[PDB]
């Protein structure tokens, strides 16, 4: 009975808490994430990227990152999806986190109730 | 499916760890809490109150606080109930915590195995 | 509704994070753990032992420890089981952790993806 895991995305340039879970051989698990920032004070491009690894490994990109650009007064709202898979021959523990980053001079306040990663 | 969450109540005048969870639009979730303190060194009135908010918002009282009072040699044991509801139109992350407070000069040791908030 | 909990075993001489959970009166819950270390640099006996307590109490051994021993080049892989039981008369919060220890001069690298405690 593996539970659903949920963590907040707390910033435009931030790394989420780690979502840690066992996964059986031949199983897969899907994670989604989204972050809402605005209104922007200026030009801003927000990227949201899930990362995953086997425990103690090296984090690597999981799924294609969501990206969104806008200017003063806009609200960015990218989202992303990615699925961890185990075909190693045995049960293993995996770790997933969510990294957000921006380019541009502008910033936007996080709409916290809808900015999170879950799966 | 979303897991049951549990945190300890560790003091007579304390705020517990946060129980954090998604809630779908139109869903509701019930939490209970209880704290056992004693034997008292003197007169004491112990209040236990759940609070809730959308993530990053303002905490508000959730449910009617439990109250229990006693004197030297008594053991207090109030409990309380509360239900979080999402009718915002979309899935949102919510936060629940438990606040305990006392009036009076007396204090009582926390009986940790039965002092917690869960839901 | 209680979720499965999982924490890493990160060393040959280490104590895991705590697994914390409510348990109803008359209920039982089983935990398993295992640790994989190698190749050994020398003689080594690896023990893996679950411990449990009522919340805030004193930890005591839970189940029969797993034991495995080897020589240079060997990979040790002990595992263990243990069952927490509540016959107190009421729901209580319990805490479980996993302790690894070795005797001998040898050491072995932890194979982290399969070294964990879960239940």
Cis bond upstream, residue A39 (ω within 30): yes
Contact A55 C116 (CB under 8 A): yes
Cα angle B53, B59, B62 (rounded to 5 degrees) comes to 80
User: C43 φ, ψ to 5°?
Assistant: -65, 135
- d(CA C35, CA A117) in angstroms, rounded, equals 30
* CA distances from residue B13 to B48, B69, B79, B109, C12 in whole angstroms, order as listed: 9, 15, 15, 12, 40
Q: Cα torsion at A107, A111, A117, A119 (round to 10°)? A: -160
* CA distances from residue C13 to C38, C79, C102 in whole angstroms, order as listed: 14, 15, 6
The answer to whether residue C2 neighbours chain B at the CB level (below 8 Å) is yes
Burial of B101 (0-12, 13-18, 19+ CB in 10 A): middle
CATH class of the domain whose range is A6-118: mainly beta
User: B26 φ, ψ to 5°?
Assistant: 85, 5
Classified as helix, coil or strand, B81 is strand
- d(CA C75, CA C68) in angstroms, rounded, equals 9
Chain A residues with beta carbon closer than 8 angstroms to that of C4: 1-3, 22
- d(CA A89, CA A30) in angstroms, rounded, equals 20
- d(CA B4, CA A103) in angstroms, rounded, equals 39
- Beta partners for residue B7, in sequence order: B117
- d(CA C114, CA C110) in angstroms, rounded, equals 9
Contact B54 A113 (CB under 8 A): yes
Residue B75 Rama label (left phi>0; alpha psi -120 to 50; beta): beta
CA distance B69 to chain A (A): 38
- d(CA C19, CA C21) in angstroms, rounded, equals 7
Contacts of C95 (CB under 8 A, 6+ apart): C18, C19, C20, C52, C53, C54, C55, C59
* CA distances from residue B70 to B39, B49, B111, C88 in whole angstroms, order as listed: 9, 18, 16, 25
- d(CA C95, CA C84) in angstroms, rounded, equals 9
- Report the sign of the C-alpha dihedral through residues A9, A14, A17, A23, in that order: positive
- d(CA B40, CA B18) in angstroms, rounded, equals 28
The answer for C 97-116 residues in CB contact with A (under 8 A) is: 110, 112-116
CA distance A62 to chain C (A): 18
- Dump the DSSP string for A60-88: EEEEEEEEEEE-TT--B--EEEEEEE--S
Number of C-alpha atoms within 13 angstroms, CB side, residue A110?
Answer: 21
Residue B49 CA to chain centroid, in angstroms? Answer: 5
């Amino acid at each position: 009975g593996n539970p659903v895991l949920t963590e907040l995305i707390t910033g435009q340039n931030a790394t989420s808490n780690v979502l840690r879970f066992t996964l059986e051989n031949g199983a897969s698990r899907q994670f989604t994430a989204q972050v809402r920032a605005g209104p922007l004070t200026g030009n801003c491009t927000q990227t949201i990227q899930l990362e995953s690894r086997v425990a103690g490994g090296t984090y690597a990109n999981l799924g294609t990152a969501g990206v969104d650009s806008g200017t003063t007064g806009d609200t960015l709202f990218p989202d992303t999806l990615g699925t961890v898979s185990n075909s190693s021959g045995q049960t293993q523990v995996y770790e997933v986190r969510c990294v957000t980053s921006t380019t541009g001079p502008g910033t936007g306040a996080i709409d916290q109730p809808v900015s999170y990663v879950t799966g």
